[PDB]
Ligand binder design. Structure first.
Ligand SMILES: CCCCCCCCCCCCCCCCCC(=O)OCC(COC(=O)CCCCCCCCCCCCCCCCC)OC(=O)CCCCCCCCCCCCCCCCC
Ligand code: HEA
Ligand code: HEA
Ligand SMILES: CCCCC/C=C\C/C=C\C/C=C\C/C=C\CCCC(=O)O[C@H](COC(=O)CCCCCCCCCCCCCCCCC)COP(=O)(O)OCCN
Ligand SMILES: CCCCCC/C=C\CCCCCCCCCC(=O)O[C@H](COC(=O)CCCCCCCCCCCCCCC)COP(=O)(O)OC[C@@H](O)CO
Ligand SMILES: CCCCCC/C=C\CCCCCCCCCC(=O)O[C@H](COC(=O)CCCCCCCCCCCCCCC)COP(=O)(O)OC[C@@H](O)CO
Ligand SMILES: CCCCCC/C=C\CCCCCCCCCC(=O)O[C@H](COC(=O)CCCCCCCCCCCCCCC)COP(=O)(O)OC[C@@H](O)CO
Ligand SMILES: CCCCCCCCCCO[C@@H]1O[C@H](CO)[C@@H](O[C@H]2O[C@H](CO)[C@@H](O)[C@H](O)[C@H]2O)[C@H](O)[C@H]1O
Ligand SMILES: CCCCCCCCCCO[C@@H]1O[C@H](CO)[C@@H](O[C@H]2O[C@H](CO)[C@@H](O)[C@H](O)[C@H]2O)[C@H](O)[C@H]1O
Ligand SMILES: CCCCCCCCCCO[C@@H]1O[C@H](CO)[C@@H](O[C@H]2O[C@H](CO)[C@@H](O)[C@H](O)[C@H]2O)[C@H](O)[C@H]1O
Ligand SMILES: C[C@H](CCC(=O)O)[C@H]1CC[C@H]2[C@@H]3[C@H](O)C[C@@H]4C[C@H](O)CC[C@]4(C)[C@H]3C[C@H](O)[C@]12C
Ligand SMILES: C[C@H](CCC(=O)O)[C@H]1CC[C@H]2[C@@H]3[C@H](O)C[C@@H]4C[C@H](O)CC[C@]4(C)[C@H]3C[C@H](O)[C@]12C
Ligand SMILES: C[C@H](CCC(=O)O)[C@H]1CC[C@H]2[C@@H]3[C@H](O)C[C@@H]4C[C@H](O)CC[C@]4(C)[C@H]3C[C@H](O)[C@]12C
Ligand SMILES: C[C@H](CCC(=O)O)[C@H]1CC[C@H]2[C@@H]3[C@H](O)C[C@@H]4C[C@H](O)CC[C@]4(C)[C@H]3C[C@H](O)[C@]12C
Ligand code: CUA
Ligand SMILES: [O-][O-]
Ligand SMILES: [Cu+2]
Ligand SMILES: [Mg+2]
Ligand code: NA
Ligand code: NA
Ligand SMILES: [Zn+2]
Lengths: 514, 259, 58, 84, 227, 43, 94, 79, 46
């Protein structure tokens, strides 16, 4: 029975649980890697070794945090648990294919771990640009293991995308149109469309890199008439949609959390929220070369990419102001999940605004490949995507498990993490403006003070991560079982109790048309 | 007991064996490229084929033999197949982007021209044109097969499907001979790289699509399809039209325009 | 060929509690055991190969 | 375009079989003829060791490492030229 | 170069860098204003026991918070693109200098007249002369004439690098097989530092750039002595 | 939310044990590696 | 040569597919493929909600085009009202 | 006709950041001019402008590689 | 069927909180420890 249930699953909730456990374990790996980065940089000089060991750590840090922590948790974890319940469906469309999306991920992670154990690892950056990642400057198996890791993660997400799109289009109650589905469901659908379109282009590009490394092709090798910059276009054609993939399910969870702890039955401006997520998804495909403003691109192309990138602020601002308008007039419950979501609104906005600074290609000449970029994306990832993950985890843990957290401990955890991430990353704006490059294991002496503060901040976040583990332990150890949950009339996923039975909606909901 | 029309699937080992086959194929390719050994790769390829066989076997058991494919389930599979084909289109789009990037801006190493100095392209009016007529013809014959099936005509369904498959095989054999006869190779710079990787992935999909048509052929021989319910045939025909259209883009772009 | 779908329908709808991947009979169990043995043994072998490749070999 | 043909009323198997045998397979037969007329080897050109061709950044994982997968001795020179 | 506890950009050495500073000041003011407004409104929404939980009509207010951000973006884009095209304008250089990236050092070529070229490596920390800067000095600096328009051409002979001098507002990727152009004009004599700005392997952190800007006559005599 | 009292209450002393064990499980192995870094590098 | 030999659904559909096909022919919807059409929803004319057990979840789209659906369990017994719009629903178990 | 050459002037054929083709074209032009002159008897001095421009713009290693391949018979451009 | 309810819809036991503490310790601790030991591994090669 144990093997049947947990290795042979065809159940959306158990598979969601598998993803949450996998993503939590990956989050520990990614945290350890982040602490090694900041230990190397926490005082001037060399701690670990030269830039190769340092940038194997940096590279693995990014792949682990993105592919094995955020996407499995948001899409595989919250998506599998919540989407079928939020539309009253009895499972996913392809419940057995769903299980393969999960089980491709431990092999993908093993391949990444293998990459770092063989030879001198893949010290390439998570962008894996040639020729540094090619077979002369990264001879041996490490980069190929990284490519294959991405291949498996990519198949996992593409099949998952097919599953979510099909489920959300085809398995709603017959009276429920797409404009009666909750915003988290919308956010997962749009994320899945971005995954479906973008990951095959990544797969093409990394396969070309694999054949340049092993079959003597020369897609990216000028000696054969290839071009390293072609790789960058294919990568970033995926890589910008990817950061919208990383935030969109977060936007969906934030809409639900803000609505719920404002005591509201609905988010402010529902159709504007749908419009904004679709607009962000669409604009996210036509801006990728803002990752390439220093490669030698014509001025008119730089002007286009500057302008197209900045436009995304308009739908994103509608979402931020709609969240604030959802709070407006609420009976505010100062739950730990609400604290995560309020921190999200503010800190995501800061990171979005530094992204708008970077969209200006003239300023980006000086800011590109410096810690100003690192500061931008850690405000939207460590204080955006992750704050939404923590908010959703604390909010829905009693649904998934049937047990409550200790809310005081969870508020303590939020407070520590909030101090930690801001101490880590706010000084990195100063380091970027003043010229500290990315992917450096050591820095000119002038940069010492902010690197020291930044590293101290990273240790505060470590303490928060350790406390999180204790808090989950304490909840399972004490076994306080949920009784009543308010606002079930507008939060269908709670209406089958905590935890819901293995099979829910065996009898579908009744929704009439009028 | 349920009162919706969707399919609760029995707990299944094939997702796990499929995922492990992916691990064995990729670690196997690594072992082959770097440690001079085909062992892991052959195991992975074997378990991959076993996984695909038993998984799609079970889908046939669930539908033809157990009746789980209600109209709602079939509609989901239709969306599933369309989305899968869309993802495959985007995969090929990356190789067409590589082709146009390199050929529209030929670098000095090439002679600054396309085709590169020293490259002698195949004549697009010889076997490439023949291959084009073959896949186009097979798109006509698979449409005849589809109409015969909907009209309840077992013999002409089988005849037309057999002709479609024969043409798929003909294309593959012609392409194999053209690969052997080609005076340029995959190592002949970006010309050979784009040519063989793009037409190579295309050829793999022709083989996949041909195999799928052959599966439909034997299920038809065993009377699995009704005149109204035959999604496996529809999916194989959509995939086959996708293979035909990718070929027409390759022909116009790489063989003709790029010659 | 004659149409024997009806007898397959009877076989795969028999009320015997078997999951669909084993419901054809003893050949299903054999093919399953072969598949899973190759997958698990191959996975162990891939781990051995990682162990080997993680160290220099002169 | 209406192409140049023209036969509906309620589409069907009979029309698509008509197209298969009356247009599609005859076109394949014509192209098969055209191709068999123009086959026959072409003179292999002088070998020139161009550096953008016969790329070898890593030995191939088969054979002696130096032969492409569908190596044809008649028309595919090695980096050092045509084989004996 | 950067100085300890620096918060903002290095002082401008070129007119284009001065334009960037003023444009950054303009944009940062807008960033601060919007960030603070959002923080303030959050606090406003959270500090009253008054409630209103029935359905709220969205149509009117969404005009405001679409139109106002569109106007703000235009107020950023206009000076942004002006600097972009001004950056791009024809200027007619007096001198062309190439730099080739390598693992892990830069080489320079001044071949308008004679065949002058040399390598430029970081000074190891153990060999710094007293008062020299760790990780920033090089053995052979890029001597250049001040107050003159210079064409820099940037490439690489191995992996990607990127040739950067923050106080001149310069960063141009070094790509093998490609020859990227940028222009450089220093308003002042002096020493202007930068660092390799594309990850390039084991010593990425340790292949810096040092420009030495002097009067033309000094540059000419230096050039002749480097042959 | 409302909830039942804990079925198996975790006293302050029990929480102190769970917290201390949790923190040591993260800190001790990494501390051992970092403490011995010189030993690894000088090898 | 227009011949036959392809089974029809009537001949060969089985299991749940066949149940759905046979019920649709009778104009019945035991597997909930169609949206039910609302009554006036008064206490006199409540929406009749079929169930194979003694409670079923109702979602109430109170007004046309509302994006918010109001969800609640409907139990066997006296008609209940949507908590937002008051329209009446009554369970009909079978 | 008369020098005072300082560096290669702006060339409207090559107005963008990537100057690879500017270097390549002036290299080709110089050697094409050279070949034409040396044959019909005349003076390579008429080719001098292209020589100065490609020398200004082209990385030494590119020139060196191209020269080696011309000597080898493997230069892929047309001269 | 399968077990339903709190503590039963998970692949790990929560019947004893101290056994659970050990299991969670091994689980999260092994993830956090792995990069330090991979770094050590790479340092002890070259
Ligand atoms: C926004 C994230 C939350 C805050 C996180 C930590 C909070 C720390 C304060 C931080 C509280 C916000 C104040 C920020 C400006 C402080 C530094 C400055 O004078 O910046 C100057 C510029 C460059 O300017 C110059 O070239 C002139 C230099 C003038 C020197 C004068 C001497 C100053 C004394 C030294 C100051 C030490 C800095 C402290 C170092 C701080 C270490 C942590 O640098 C920069 O652009 C940095 C670019 C940052 C872009 C992100 C903007 C986010 C704004 C959010 C604020 C909302 C409401 C505030 C209220 C926010 C309260 C939450
Ligand atoms: C969650 C992930 C995430 C998100 C959501 C974003 C969102 C944005 N990013 Fe970010 N970005 C990254 C993750 C993300 N980014 C990563 C990982 C990198 C680096 C990759 C690498 O090199 O490794 C990066 C790099 C990156 C660059 C390249 C910089 C360089 O390398 O030199 C740029 C440049 O334009 C950019 C811009 C933006 C913009 C304009 C947005 C916008 O979507 C933000 C829009 C939001 C707002 C503007 C705030 C809310 C709005 C209002 C309150 C309305 C009013 C506001 C105005 C009127 C301005 N990003
Ligand atoms: C989701 C993405 C993500 C996240 C969360 C983080 C988190 C952190 N990152 Fe990361 N980082 C990247 C993505 C991310 N990073 C990327 C893409 C790069 C560029 C790589 C490259 O240059 O190639 C990068 C680069 C980068 C650098 C630059 C290295 C360089 O240029 O040399 C630094 C340095 O300080 C850094 C530090 C940190 C720190 C201290 C954290 C800390 O905030 C981490 C703190 C801990 C957490 C945030 C908790 C994590 C765990 C969970 C959330 C699981 C929760 C469990 C349950 C819910 C059950 N990162
Ligand atoms: C014969 C008719 C066509 C049928 C298809 C034939 C092969 C298809 C196989 C897969 C094709 C996919 C791309 C593989 C890359 C190269 C294959 C290109 C097609 C091909 O077969 O190219 C051959 C080279 O094969 C080679 O190098 C090596 C060939 C074998 C090595 C395969 C390497 C592994 C590739 C892994 C790709 C991972 C993809 C994952 C995508 C997931 C998303 C060309 O032979 P040649 O001697 O160079 O020139 C002919 C000279 N007379
Ligand atoms: C470097 C080399 C790397 C190699 C990596 C290989 C990785 C994976 C190993 C793959 C093993 C595949 C085994 C067969 C999987 C068949 C899946 C399938 O057919 O899934 C179907 C759904 O997907 C659908 O239709 C439509 C979708 C069909 C997808 C078929 C499988 C595709 C796998 C590769 C996808 C790559 C996409 C690439 C685009 C770049 C059915 O879904 P189930 O939930 O099963 O059933 C539901 C029941 O109601 C059926 O009666
Ligand atoms: C709706 C339309 C939006 C704009 C899309 C335009 C796409 C194709 C533009 C092709 C422009 C070529 C014009 C011919 C002459 C100049 C070619 C050149 O030299 O440009 C080179 C770029 O080449 C290249 O292939 C570029 C290759 C194509 C990249 C397009 C990215 C889209 C990928 C997903 C689809 C440089
Ligand atoms: C080397 C590796 C690849 C090797 C070759 C694989 C060839 C593909 C064979 C697929 C066979 C699928 C058979 C099962 C099937 O066709 O199942 C049908 C459902 O469709 C379905 O799942 C449709 C599911 C099919 C999706 C297949 C798509 C191809 C996947 C190939 C992998 C892509 C790799 C790309 C690499 C770049 C069953 O429903 P019906 O037909 O309506 O029958 C019911 C009636 O009888 C009732 O009256
Ligand atoms: C899941 C992650 C997996 C990552 C995969 C990385 C690639 C793994 C392939 C490596 O396989 C090893 O290759 C060696 C070299 O071919 C073999 O030794 C062979 O060659 C040795 C060196 O000559 C000799 O000592 C031995 O006789 C002989 O067994 C060894 O047995 C084999 O296992
Ligand atoms: C970034 C994540 C890590 C953050 C910081 C970790 C905080 C460190 C926690 C303590 O770790 C222990 O520290 C001891 C020293 O205090 C080490 O003992 C070492 O030193 C002792 C004292 O000299 C000797 O008695 C021991 O034998 C010798 O192993 C011991 O191995 C190590 O487990
Ligand atoms: C251990 C906690 C989780 C581990 C995850 C994978 C880490 C594997 C580490 C490799 O171990 C070390 O390699 C060194 C050779 O350079 C030696 C040392 O003796 C060995 O042990
Ligand atoms: C970046 C990409 C080239 C990718 C490649 O080198 O492979 C090119 C191809 C087509 C280009 C676009 C088209 O030329 C149309 C537009 C032309 C404008 O002058 C700039 C924006 C503009 C929208 C271009 C931006 C960018 O240069 C594009 C998208
Ligand atoms: C055996 C079967 C008769 C129909 C039935 O079983 O009732 C017949 C009808 C259609 C026949 C097939 C089709 O006519 C197409 C093919 C024609 C080739 O000449 C022989 C194989 C070929 C594949 C035939 C084999 C076999 O004779 C088939 C399959
Ligand atoms: C069901 C189970 C799979 C367990 C798994 O999923 O972990 C069993 C059933 C038959 C077993 C296989 C073989 O029939 C027997 C092999 C020898 C031993 O008895 C066990 C390993 C052995 C190689 C088995 C692997 C695996 O444990 C199998 C496949
Ligand atoms: C028409 C459509 C859906 C309305 C509905 O059927 O409920 C609504 C939903 C979101 C609306 C958009 C968003 O509110 C954002 C913009 C707001 C501006 O006031 C008008 C244009 C604007 C772009 C709106 C146009 C239009 O009214 C949209 C697109
Ligand atoms: Cu050179 Cu980084
Ligand atoms: O990517 O921003
Ligand atoms: Cu981007
Ligand atoms: Mg860069
Ligand atoms: Na350091
Ligand atoms: Na059909
Ligand atoms: Zn109502």
């Amino acid at each position: 029975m144990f093997i049947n249930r947990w290795l042979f699953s065809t159940n959306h909730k158990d598979i969601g649980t598998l993803y949450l456990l996998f993503g939590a374990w990956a989050g520990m790996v990614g945290t350890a890697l982040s602490l090694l980065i900041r230990a190397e940089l926490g005082q001037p000089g060399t701690l670990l070794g030269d830039d190769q060991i340092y940038n194997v750590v940096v590279t693995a840090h990014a792949f682990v945090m993105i592919f094995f922590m955020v996407m499995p948790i948001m899409i595989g974890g919250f998506g599998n648990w919540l989407v079928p319940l939020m539309i009253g469906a009895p499972d996913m469309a392809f419940p057995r294919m769903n299980n393969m999306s999960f089980w491709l991920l431990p092999p993908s992670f093993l391949l990444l771990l293998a990459s770092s154990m063989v030879e001198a690892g893949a010290g390439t950056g998570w962008t894996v640009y040639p020729p540094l990642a090619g077979n002369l400057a990264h001879a041996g198996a490490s980069v190929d293991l990284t490519i294959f890791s991405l291949h498996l993660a990519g198949v996992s997400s593409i099949l998952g995308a097919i599953n979510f799109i099909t489920t959300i289009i085809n398995m709603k109650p017959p009276a429920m149109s797409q404009y009666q589905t909750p915003l988290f469901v919308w956010s997962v659908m749009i994320t899945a469309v971005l995954l479906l379109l973008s990951l095959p282009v990544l797969a093409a590009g990394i396969t070309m890199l694999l054949t340049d490394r092993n079959l003597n092709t020369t897609f990216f090798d000028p000696a054969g008439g290839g071009d390293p910059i072609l790789y960058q276009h294919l990568f970033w054609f995926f890589g910008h949609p990817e950061v919208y993939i990383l935030i969109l399910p977060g936007f969906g969870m934030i809409s639900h959390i803000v609505t719920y702890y404002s005591g509201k039955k609905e988010p402010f401006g529902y159709m504007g929220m749908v419009w904004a997520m679709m607009s962000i998804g669409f604009l996210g495909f036509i801006v990728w070369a803002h990752h390439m403003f220093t490669v030698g691109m014509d001025v008119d192309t730089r002007a286009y990419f500057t302008s197209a990138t900045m436009i995304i602020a308009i739908p994103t601002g509608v979402k931020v102001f709609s969240w604030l308008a959802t709070l407006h007039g609420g009976n505010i419950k100062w739950s730990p999940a609400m604290m995560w979501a309020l921190g999200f609104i503010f800190l995501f906005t800061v990171g979005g605004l530094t992204g708008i600074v970077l969209a200006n290609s003239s300023l980006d000449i000086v800011l590109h490949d410096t810690y100003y970029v690192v500061a931008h994306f850690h405000y939207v990832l460590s204080m955006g995507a992750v704050f939404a993950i923590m908010g959703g985890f604390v909010h829905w843990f009693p649904l998934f498990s049937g047990y409550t957290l200790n809310d005081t401990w969870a508020k303590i955890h939020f407070a520590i993490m909030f101090v930690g991430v801001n101490m880590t990353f706010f000084p990195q704006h100063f380091l970027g403006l003043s010229g500290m490059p990315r992917r450096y294991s050591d820095y000119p002496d002038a940069y010492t003070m902010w690197n020291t503060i930044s590293s101290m901040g990273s240790f505060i976040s470590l303490t928060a991560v350790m406390l999180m583990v204790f808090i989950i332990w304490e909840a399972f150890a004490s076994k306080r079982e949920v009784l009543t949950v308010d606002l079930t009339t507008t939060n269908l996923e709670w209406l089958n109790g905590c935890p819901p039975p293995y099979h829910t909606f065996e009898e579908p909901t009744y929704v009439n048309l009028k | 007991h349920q009162t919706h029309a969707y399919h609760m699937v029995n707990p299944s080992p094939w997702p796990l064996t499929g995922a492990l086959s992916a691990l064995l194929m990729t670690s196997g390719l690594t072992m082959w490229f770097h440690f001079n050994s085909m062992t892991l790769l052959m195991i992975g390829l074997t378990t991959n084929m076993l996984t695909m066989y038993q998984w799609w076997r079970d889908v046939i058991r669930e539908s033809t033999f157990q009746g789980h494919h209600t109209p709602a389930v079939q509609k989901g599979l239709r969306y599933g197949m369309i989305l899968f084909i869309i993802s495959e289109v985007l995969f090929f789009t990356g190789f067409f982007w590589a082709f146009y990037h390199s050929s529209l801006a030929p670098t000095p190493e090439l002679g600054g021209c396309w085709p590169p100095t020293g490259i002698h392209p195949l004549n697009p009016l010889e076997v490439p044109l023949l291959n084009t007529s073959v896949l186009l013809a097979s798109g006509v014959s698979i449409t005849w097969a589809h109409h015969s099936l909907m009209e309840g005509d077992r013999k002409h369904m089988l005849q037309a499907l057999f002709i479609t498959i024969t043409l798929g095989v003909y294309f593959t054999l012609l392409q194999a001979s053209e690969y052997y006869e080609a005076p340029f190779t995959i190592s002949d710079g970006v010309y050979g790289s784009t040519f063989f990787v793009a037409t190579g992935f295309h050829g793999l999909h022709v083989i996949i699509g041909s195999t799928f048509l052959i599966v439909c052929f034997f299920r038809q021989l065993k009377f699995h399809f009704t005149s109204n319910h035959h999604f496996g045939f529809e999916a194989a025909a959509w995939y086959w039209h996708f293979v035909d259209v990718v070929w027409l883009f390759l022909y116009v772009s790489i063989y003709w325009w790029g010659s | 060929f004659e149409n024997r779908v009806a007898e397959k329908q009877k076989l795969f709808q028999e009320d015997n509690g078997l999951p669909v991947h084993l419901k054809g009979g003893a050949t299903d169990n054999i093919l399953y055991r072969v598949t899973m043995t190759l997958c698990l043994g191959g996975t162990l072998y891939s781990l051995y190969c990682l162990g080997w490749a993680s160290f220099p070999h002169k | 375009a209406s192409a140049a043909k023209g036969d509906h009323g309620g589409t069907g198997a009979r029309t698509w079989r008509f197209l298969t045998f009356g247009l599609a397979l005859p076109s394949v037969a014509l192209c098969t003829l055209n191709s068999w007329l123009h086959s026959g080897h072409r003179e292999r050109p002088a070998f020139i060791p161009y550096h953008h061709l016969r790329i070898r950044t890593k030995p191939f994982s088969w054979g002696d490492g130096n032969h492409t997968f569908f190596h044809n001795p008649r028309v595919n020179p090695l980096p050092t030229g045509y084989e004996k | 170069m950067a100085y300890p506890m620096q918060l903002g950009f290095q002082d401008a050495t070129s007119p284009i860098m001065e334009e960037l500073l003023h444009f950054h000041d303009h944009t940062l003011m807008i960033v601060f204003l919007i960030s603070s407004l959002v923080l303030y409104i959050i606090s406003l929404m959270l500090t009253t026991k008054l409630t209103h939980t029935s359905t709220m009509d969205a149509q009117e207010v969404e005009t405001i918070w679409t139109i106002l951000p569109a106007i703000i973006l235009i107020l950023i884009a206009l000076p942004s693109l002006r600097i972009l095209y001004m950056m791009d304008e024809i200027n007619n250089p007096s001198l062309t200098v190439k730099t080739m990236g390598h693992q892990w050092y830069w080489s320079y070529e001044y071949t308008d007249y004679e065949d002058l070229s040399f390598d430029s490596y970081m000074i190891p920390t153990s060999e710094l002369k007293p008062g020299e800067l760790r990780l920033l000095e090089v053995d052979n600096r890029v001597v250049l004439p001040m107050e003159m328009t210079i064409r820099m051409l940037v490439s690489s002979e191995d992996v990607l690098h990127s040739w950067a001098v923050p106080s001149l507002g310069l960063k141009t990727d070094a790509i093998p097989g490609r020859l990227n152009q940028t222009t450089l004009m220093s308003s002042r004599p002096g020493l202007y530092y930068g660092q390799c700005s594309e990850i390039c392997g084991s010593n990425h952190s340790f292949m810096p750039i040092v420009l030495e800007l002097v009067p033309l006559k000094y540059f000419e005599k230096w050039s002749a002595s480097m042959l | 939310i409302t909830a039942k009292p804990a079925k198996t209450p975790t006293s302050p002393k029990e929480q102190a044990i769970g917290l201390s064990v949790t923190f040591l499980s993260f800190l001790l192995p990494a501390g051992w590696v970092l403490y011995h870094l010189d030993n690894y590098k000088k090898s | 040569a227009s011949g036959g030999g392809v089974p029809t659904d009537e001949e060969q559909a089985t299991g749940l597919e066949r149940e759905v096909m046979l019920a649709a022919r009778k104009g019945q919807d035991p597997y909930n493929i169609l949206a039910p059409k609302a009554t006036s929803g008064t206490k006199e004319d409540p929406n009749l909600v079929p169930s194979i057990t003694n409670k079923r979840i109702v979602g109430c789209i109170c007004e046309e085009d509302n994006s918010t659906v109001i969800w609640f369990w409907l139990h066997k017994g006296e008609a209940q009202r949507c908590p937002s719009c008051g329209t009446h629903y009554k369970l009909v178990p079978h | 006709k008369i020098k005072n050459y300082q560096t290669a002037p702006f060339d409207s054929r090559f107005p963008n950041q990537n100057q690879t083709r500017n270097c390549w074209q002036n290299y080709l032009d110089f050697h094409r001019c050279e070949k034409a002159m040396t044959a019909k008897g005349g003076d390579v001095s008429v080719c001098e402008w292209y020589r100065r421009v490609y020398k200004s713009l082209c990385p030494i290693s590119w020139v060196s590689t191209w020269d080696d391949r011309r000597a080898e018979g493997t230069f892929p451009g047309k001269i | 069927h399968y077990e339903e309810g709190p503590g039963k819809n998970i692949p790990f036991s929560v019947e004893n909180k101290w056994r659970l503490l050990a299991m969670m310790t091994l689980f999260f601790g092994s993830g956090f420890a792995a990069p330090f030991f991979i770094v050590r591994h790479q340092l002890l090669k070259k």
